[PDB]
Amino acid sequence: PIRRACISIVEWKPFEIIILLTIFANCVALAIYIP
């Protein structure tokens, strides 16, 4: 349908970059945490 076609194009170059940046932010947030 239209939704599948419009969502199939939402993956391109900056998407991977922002995903990796979010992963790094999660890693540093876990590192900051102190038990």
Residue at token pair 């590192």: 31
Method: cryo-EM
Q: Say how far residue 14 (Cα) sits from the centre of its chain.
A: 10
Determine the straight-line distance between the first and last CA of the chain, rounded to whole angstroms. 49
What whole-number distance in Å separates Cα of residue 33 and Cα of residue 31?
6
Q: What is the secondary structure of 1-35 as a DSSP string?
A: -HHHHHHHTS-SHHHHHHHHHHHHHHHHHHHH---
Amino acid at 9: I
The angstrom resolution of this structure is 3.1
Amino acid at 24: F
